[PDB]
């Protein structure tokens, strides 16, 4: 009877439709753009030779000349739109060519203008000019993610504020944790970030509403938003003349201020020739700190609270701030306040609204009915919506600039704490920027800032938006990562805690800290992960202030020792090993580092390893699908049985624990590298015990590795241990029997390649195989995916159930940080296998994967691939090609590792270990690299087809001179060292 | 520095402020409204001598006119308008008095004319007529409770869909549990229930937009809403004179429709003399399946679903569903469709829009940009956005009529279950709304089905407000509860399950559907609780599918035998104590109904009891704010140590658990009830053994209560049995060294009072004690508090601090169910006390009670009382005399069960013992009741002042005959008795 059509499933596309009917008629060219006419899907309205896919029929619909027009022959009649000379014509089925009047064709023209622009440009610094009135690629694309600074203050990770801001300047603002300043939105779109008030205000005249800040009407003439590297700045021109410019960022924190202060300016100037009375009323919405509450009682979080009123020493009011009655809601107290700067006159606002009711009254947010008119009533209840009004006179050709000032004190960083505290935070804030020019100088701060820490690395090869897209967008973006991890984003909005495995952020930060002066700060950060480490040496799974999950995923605590190994080979500072930090059992108890790293070492070498001796899988390991083993253990459960297991066979401390759980073959690399590691951090050291023990147990472990782990054409996941008859024995190569695609024998993981490359295990003939793997099985259009299709209900019952139409996460979609640790063993492999066309070929992989994550390249074919042109995203869509957020992602990080290291930089135990690949068609790469107490200059040049010093001729100079010796000192004489290479 | 000013701490508000510098210039009447003109309060804008409290100012200040007007004098001067003669002035502080122009002049008397009126008005029938652009009281008031009907299909209580609209048609509708058909809101705003879209529908003509449902703008000139029972209608006249009507209701089940289905109907009238080319977009959201993702994972809430069209058998477009991949949300399946009937053409939508951001487009969804050319793209993903488009020419003078039908079909009514059952669903459903009048005879169903319910206990006073309030509006709360329990509303909106002691609905309701032929669905109401009660006694707390929490709380089985007295003392139907019924420890164990009450009686009364033999508090009872005892256990692990205990002391089972629990008093009293249930219960049955047992029982637990809880001036609340030193002993009445008054010494608990009565434990002297204290420290101007106030950290820390400003819920509100529970005891006191003076008074303070929670009077100062005329709300603040949602309660079910005992109606062995008691003023009271097998007509003549049978001289006559007989028969003779009653 009545049948159903998916989105997925419906034949043939509008475009598709054009074309049959149109295609040899007319020339389509290489983009075009069309609609149904009706919901059947017979006939189509379509427009030809687009420079790129764009929504332009949308966008003509909207035009009513346009769409009155089109209504002569849709519904019942497809039409396409052609342009010959610079003359539209309109195209019927039966070959009738119809030339457009006068205003369609104006309308048509200025709409097809400039479609290959419409969402947006970057400038030459790498920042996104955004017109307000285009449609957005995805929900991410527009969006900018703001810091503040807490360097030089304590629990800088848990503690520095964090905004995001899209091109409206809507988003919302967050102090430590998830603790909400400006309200958070959990609601069914993407788009909606934060409560749709926020950032937002309205200007009025003669008691009428001229501007809102979040809508645009016809009323204005130009309006554009620019991010920039953290802030945000939107412009906007009246038909009137007046000029308005807001500019958003975050304070960096200094003594005596509030815990968080977003700052958003708001100049308005008249450039006509007659003075304007105006007025502004700033707006927006307080989050609750009552955040389940939302969910579980609405009118719980309005009851709590009531509004505020502030006074300065004046008596005069300068804004609002919620309070509440509980006490676990008054260890934080939130402030807005207003300047506004009208020529010699400094004022503060002269009214408010704090009930959201009374001030939309029989309105609408967009257009108020109390805007005007603010009732000057502090509201019994939540929510803390906020209104500020103030009155101006602006004189012909000057500007009025108002400051507002939104944020919250906090008992996290006061002892003694109470709103008392807050109202003096507020009070030096408001004395710091009672000079107009402070809040400039402030943004000049952060924007050098901001400047002098990507210095570590400077690329410049004339592509500039490559050269911004790393030099600045990047090095932010690791930046952002190192202080904030996973937990804040557009779509990252829940509380999440700091993995433990996500100290691979600071992997690539730490140098870019150590170069500005930090190095302490790095050295904080590995104590901060070291000591939630356990005595045994698993890893509490999470933290913020204190620590979680005890050794529930497997894979935790290796990462520890790629940070150490990093930091001690960069630095030379063996010094760390010597500190006493907190062992996670607690008690007060404290163990040396290098105590700590063997423990790490010891449980999934020794105690924790399976039948093989390779570390086992627990629950899971870097790879949460992995839920093989049903009744897998946590590491205190793990403790006890262990113990108990001594005690009942006469065993010693180190012996492994029995059992037949899975086998982890990720975390037995993660183990190889760690122990290499560790043994060359011991010679450092003149640790000759140490250093022995780690050799002989390295060597060990690539025996277990290479004896129970290669499988015929590829290395395991994981063995399995619980099928005594041999039914299943592994997962991860041919012959596994767990492929869910009847075209392939075995499931194959990215992963098992990578890290048996980076972990130095993989022969050169074994890479050459898994490579071939790669390129039949897990290389699609899109880039490298995570794993080919499997059946793990045969051996395993739940993560089952699949979630994901094809080409989304799990269902086969290019997670972009895994494609990018395979880019790394890649870019490893290809400096050294000894067969030349072996390393051409995985550079061309290595090259085609960054292509597809770049940011800047996002603009490319921006409503395809969409995304976000100067911040990473998550994954690629494989069905379609579009990238997906969220934002931050470990994607940043290690193309930031893998674009260093393809410029040759790797910093090895005698110094710089220099070997660039380029790409085959450059002929120059240049740029700058700084070091503590020296600083490069590299030029590299080749001709054009692949070159590597391994099998290229080539010659190396250093400062003047022919050096055979490629790795280069790390120079401490404080001057600039000139490298050049050229391949002949 | 900086200072702080609270809502609450502000010194002085505008109208104190305008009396001040007014007050002895002008009359201000008894009602006044005034705004501070600035932010520090220094003077006041103002209007005298209003009929009510409202917001004028506001409403003036909306006002073009007047607000430019009062610029010449705010902010600096303060000023109040006033009307002398029917001419208005302002006056300012210096006594000019200011004929204002007659522009102004007409503003203000066209806002002042109808002041009483702008919360809206109540039909005679109880319907609430609502004016769409006037101010609400609070979030509550303008809403409305749909529901639809299962009686006579498998599970009704957890199969029933509802719906929850406000005046403009906002808000959400859903299925079983919390299943979203139409999507809810979970944001800042109690305001807003459900995402903005939802029940809305734009109308273009020209492509030009000229109306949406959910904006008044100038071209609407009438726009109202009625609330009626079970539906809504909405009506709108533009100045074009378009009459639109919105029609809202559910369907109630037919055999082979959709589990749930929601109708509204849209009526678009040309009252011009000219024919209009019209369109519709009829729009709105899908509730996701993923509810937890939308706080922690948005984008995955949208990858996983994608659009789908739907198509009749013709191939015509008919709507949407929303499709998922993951089959846990395929096992519900949603959808949308629409009919255009004009005149005699039938028809479907022609176009649709399926993506959020494509229809707003540059817009806003109030005037979306894509609104008007929906582009016929069915979603790749998330979230279930739709809008259906239509066009339509109407004829002047003519009507066209357009049918949405939105729901779900659901594996919970169907086996084998896939999107096939909703398509052969969906297509009964269209099938059944084929011809343009079944949707009128579906409505005219649900009218008749009410008001045939309603039947049981029918009001005729000289008071329509009261009588519709009782007949049809409590009436109709009382079945809604009965079905949904706490479960849904404009505020509540998590999933909640179905409390265990909220048997307390079935306690008012079942009497109605006894009385419509739904005797069975009483008995499968009792045997469903039934079986969430465990072998020895205790009960699942919660229950919707399965049950939970087992004997978490101490009180819950006890209620439920209530509900079998109720039900077998008015029907005398004792064959379900022989009903195998499931237990709740499962294993396919099944207990004899019978056996099952025993031991209800057995746990509280013998096993779980403390030192004073008074049942166990444990967690917490009816109360759950007495965590008392940190250490308490649920009836589980109770079990397992009880069964420990036997071994260990050589015991037998039915003696006591040991322990230094500390006991429960109104448990007591809950017990005490029940066991004198039990043992009339067994007296009709003819089992004189329990009979027996029972009363000896009773008279022992009594005994124990007398001796062990009476505390000099009231009865006790809970019994401490842990400090030996006697340091606290209990907690409840004077000297328990628990008051945090000064002021007071003791707390006194309402329902130690309530429950003394009600099982009637308390002697008269006991009865006037408590009623003195009640007087004296429970009873305030806006009702009887639940507790005074108590510092409970003396003997139980871990506790909380309070939560609430003074006067929100546990700190010192009235809360109405409670007061309610109290007024039954007032009332019960009231009939059969000796001192005539102490019935006075208790009846005095019943009708004070019960005036403050009658719904229909918060229409008679609603900006101040604001709550719901037609439906309970949940608390009264005693700060502000606000009554507070939710809307669902048990003030409903106990204030129907107080005002059928205040008509004199009690059910006992031998008929209905006939004892009312009239208010003083009152000089007659009728009503009509309906029983089984005869109804009765009852009229009661007094004069004023306060009469009763127990102290007052009267006549009693049933058909014609004196009798001294005050127990009427129950009739069965299906005719009409004539009981008529005169106090002389
Ligand atoms: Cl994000
Ligand atoms: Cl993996
Ligand atoms: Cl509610
Ligand atoms: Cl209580």
């Given at each position: 009877m009545?049948?159903?059509?998916?989105?997925?499933?419906?034949?043939?596309t509008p475009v598709e439709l054009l074309n049959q009917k149109?295609?040899?008629?007319?020339?389509?060219?290489?983009?075009?753009?069309?609609?149904?006419?009706?919901?059947?899907?017979?006939?189509?309205?379509?427009?030809?030779?687009?420079?790129?896919?764009?929504?332009?029929?949308?966008?003509?619909?909207?035009?009513?000349?346009?769409?009155?027009?089109?209504?002569?022959?849709?519904?019942?009649?497809?039409?396409?739109?052609?342009?010959?000379?610079?003359?539209?014509?309109?195209?019927?089925?039966?070959?009738?060519?119809?030339?457009?009047?006068?205003?369609?064709?104006?309308?048509?023209?200025?709409?097809?203008?400039?479609?290959?622009?419409?969402?947006?440009?970057?400038?030459?610094?790498?920042?996104?000019?955004?017109?307000?009135?285009?449609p957005a690629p995805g929900p991410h694309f527009y969006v900018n993610l703001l810091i503040g600074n807490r360097l030089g203050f304590k629990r800088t990770l848990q503690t520095t504020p964090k905004s995001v801001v899209d091109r409206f300047g809507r988003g919302s603002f967050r102090s430590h944790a998830a603790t909400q300043v400006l309200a958070t939105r959990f609601d069914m779109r993407q788009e909606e970030n934060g409560?749709?008030?926020?950032?937002?205000?309205?200007?009025?005249?003669?008691?009428?509403?001229?501007?809102?800040?979040?809508?645009?009407?016809?009323?204005?003439?130009?309006?554009?938003?620019?991010?920039?590297?953290?802030?945000?700045?939107?412009?906007?021109?009246?038909?009137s003349n007046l000029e308005i410019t807001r500019t958003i960022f975050l304070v960096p924190h200094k003594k005596g201020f509030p815990l968080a202060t977003e700052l958003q300016r708001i100049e308005i100037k008249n450039a006509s020739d007659k003075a304007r009375n105006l007025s502004i009323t700033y707006t927006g919405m307080f989050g609750?700190?009552?955040?389940?509450?939302?969910?579980?009682?609405?009118?719980?979080?309005?009851?709590?609270?009531?509004?505020?009123?502030?006074?300065?020493?004046?008596?005069?009011?300068?804004?609002?701030?919620?309070?509440?009655?509980?006490?676990?809601?008054?260890?934080?107290?939130?402030?807005?306040?207003?300047?506004?700067?009208?020529?010699?006159?400094?004022?503060?606002?002269?009214?408010?609204?704090?009930?959201?009711?009374?001030?939309?009254?029989?309105?609408?947010?967009?257009?108020?009915?109390?805007?005007?008119?603010?009732?000057?009533?502090?509201?019994?209840?939540?929510?803390?919506?906020?209104?500020?009004?103030?009155?101006?006179?602006?004189?012909?050709?000057?500007?009025?600039?108002?400051?507002?000032?939104?944020?919250?004190?906090?008992?996290?960083?006061?002892?003694?704490?109470?709103?008392?505290?807050?109202?003096?935070?507020?009070?030096?804030?408001?004395?710091?920027?009672?000079?107009?020019?402070?809040?400039?100088?402030?943004?000049?701060?952060?924007?050098?800032?901001?400047?002098?820490?990507?210095?570590?690395?400077?690329?410049?090869?004339?592509?500039?938006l490559f050269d911004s897209g790393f030099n600045r967008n990047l090095a932010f973006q690791v930046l952002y990562q190192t202080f904030m991890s996973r937990s804040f984003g557009q779509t990252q909005k829940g509380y999440r805690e700091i993995g433990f495995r996500e100290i691979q952020d600071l992997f690539a930060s730490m140098?870019?800290?150590?170069?500005?002066?930090?190095?302490?700060?790095?050295?904080?950060?590995l104590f901060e992960w070291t000591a939630n480490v356990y005595k045994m040496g698993y890893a509490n799974h999470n933290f913020y202030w204190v620590g979680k999950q005890p050794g529930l995923y497997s894979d935790d605590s290796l990462w520890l020792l790629q940070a150490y190994y990093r930091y001690i080979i960069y630095t030379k500072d063996t010094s760390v090993l010597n500190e006493e930090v907190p062992v996670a059992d607690g008690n007060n108890e404290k163990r040396a580092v290098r105590e700590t790293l063997k423990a790490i070492i010891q449980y999934s070498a020794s105690i924790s390893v399976g039948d093989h001796g390779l570390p086992l899988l627990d629950l899971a390991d870097w790879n949460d699908s992995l839920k093989i083993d049903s009744n897998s253990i946590d590491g205190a459960t793990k403790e006890k049985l262990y113990y108990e297991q001594l005690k009942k066979t006469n065993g010693k401390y180190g012996d492994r624990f029995m059992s037949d759980y899975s086998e982890s073959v990720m975390n037995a690399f993660l183990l190889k590298l760690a122990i290499d590691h560790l043994a060359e951090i011991a010679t450092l050291d003149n640790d000759t015990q140490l250093a022995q023990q780690m050799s002989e147990l390295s060597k060990e472990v690539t025996d277990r590795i290479q004896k129970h782990a290669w499988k015929e054409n590829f290395f395991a996941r994981v063995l399995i241990n619980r099928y005594k008859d041999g039914s299943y024995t592994y997962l991860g190569a041919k012959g596994d029997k767990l492929s869910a695609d009847p075209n392939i024998d075995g499931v194959y993981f990215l992963n098992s390649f990578a890290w048996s490359v980076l972990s130095d295990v993989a022969t050169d003939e074994q890479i050459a195989i898994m490579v071939d793997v790669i390129k039949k099985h897990l290389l699609?259009?899109?880039?490298?995916?995570?794993?080919?299709?499997?059946?793990?209900?045969?051996?395993?019952?739940?993560?089952?159930?699949?979630?994901?139409?094809?080409?989304?996460?799990?269902?086969?979609?290019?997670?972009?940080?895994?494609?990018?640790?395979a880019v790394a063993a890649l870019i490893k492999a290809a400096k050294k296998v000894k067969d030349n066309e072996l390393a051409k070929e995985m550079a061309r992989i290595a090259y085609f994967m960054i292509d597809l994550v770049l940011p800047y390249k996002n603009l490319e074919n921006p409503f395809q691939v969409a995304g976000n042109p100067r911040i990473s995203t998550q994954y690629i869509n494989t069905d379609t090609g579009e990238n997906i957020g969220p934002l931050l992602s470990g994607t940043a990080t290690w193309l930031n590792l893998n674009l260093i290291s393809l410029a040759g930089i790797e910093y090895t135990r005698d110094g710089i270990s220099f070997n660039p690949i380029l790409r085959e068609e450059e002929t120059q790469l240049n740029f700058t690299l700084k070091a503590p107490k020296s600083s490069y200059k590299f030029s590299i040049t080749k001709p054009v087809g692949f070159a590597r010093m391994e099998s290229s001729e080539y010659e190396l100079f250093v400062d003047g001179q022919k050096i055979d010796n490629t790795v280069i000192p790390m120079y401490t004489d404080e001057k600039e060292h000139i490298v050049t290479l050229k391949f002949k």
């Open positions: 009545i049948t159903k059509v998916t989105a997925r499933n419906n034949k043939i149109f295609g040899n008629k007319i020339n389509l060219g290489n983009f075009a753009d069309a609609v149904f006419t009706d919901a059947a899907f017979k006939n189509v309205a379509g427009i030809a030779n687009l420079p790129m896919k764009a929504p332009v029929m949308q966008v003509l619909m909207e035009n009513s000349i346009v769409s009155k027009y089109l209504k002569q022959f849709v519904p019942d009649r497809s039409v396409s739109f052609v342009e010959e000379g610079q003359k539209f014509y309109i195209v019927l089925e039966d070959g009738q060519k119809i030339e457009v009047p006068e205003d369609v064709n104006k309308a048509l023209k200025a709409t097809v203008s400039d479609v290959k622009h419409w969402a947006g440009y970057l400038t030459e610094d790498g920042e996104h000019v955004i017109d307000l009135l285009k409560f749709p008030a926020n950032r937002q205000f309205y200007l009025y005249e003669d008691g009428k509403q001229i501007f809102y800040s979040a809508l645009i009407d016809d009323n204005i003439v130009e309006a554009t938003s620019k991010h920039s590297s953290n802030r945000t700045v939107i412009k906007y021109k009246t038909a609750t700190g009552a955040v389940h509450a939302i969910f579980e009682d609405v009118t719980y979080t309005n009851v709590i609270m009531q509004s505020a009123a502030l006074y300065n020493d004046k008596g005069e009011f300068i804004g609002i701030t919620p309070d509440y009655y509980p006490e676990e809601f008054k260890q934080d107290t939130r402030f807005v306040t207003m300047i506004v700067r009208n020529g010699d006159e400094k004022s503060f606002p002269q009214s408010f609204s704090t009930d959201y009711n009374d001030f939309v009254g029989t309105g609408t947010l967009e257009h108020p009915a109390g805007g005007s008119n603010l009732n000057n009533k502090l509201n019994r209840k939540g929510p803390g919506f906020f209104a500020l009004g103030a009155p101006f006179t602006v004189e012909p050709g000057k500007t009025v600039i108002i400051d507002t000032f939104t944020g919250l004190s906090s008992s996290k960083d006061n002892e003694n704490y109470s709103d008392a505290v807050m109202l003096r935070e507020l009070d030096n804030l408001l004395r710091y920027f009672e000079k107009s020019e402070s809040v400039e100088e402030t943004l000049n701060e952060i924007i050098n800032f901001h400047e002098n820490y990507g210095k570590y690395f400077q690329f410049n090869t004339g592509n500039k140098y870019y800290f150590i170069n500005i002066g930090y190095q302490d700060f790095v050295k904080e950060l699609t259009p899109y880039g490298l995916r995570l794993v080919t299709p499997a059946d793990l209900n045969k051996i395993a019952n739940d993560t089952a159930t699949g979630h994901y139409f094809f080409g989304d996460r799990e269902n086969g979609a290019v997670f972009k940080h895994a494609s990018m640790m």
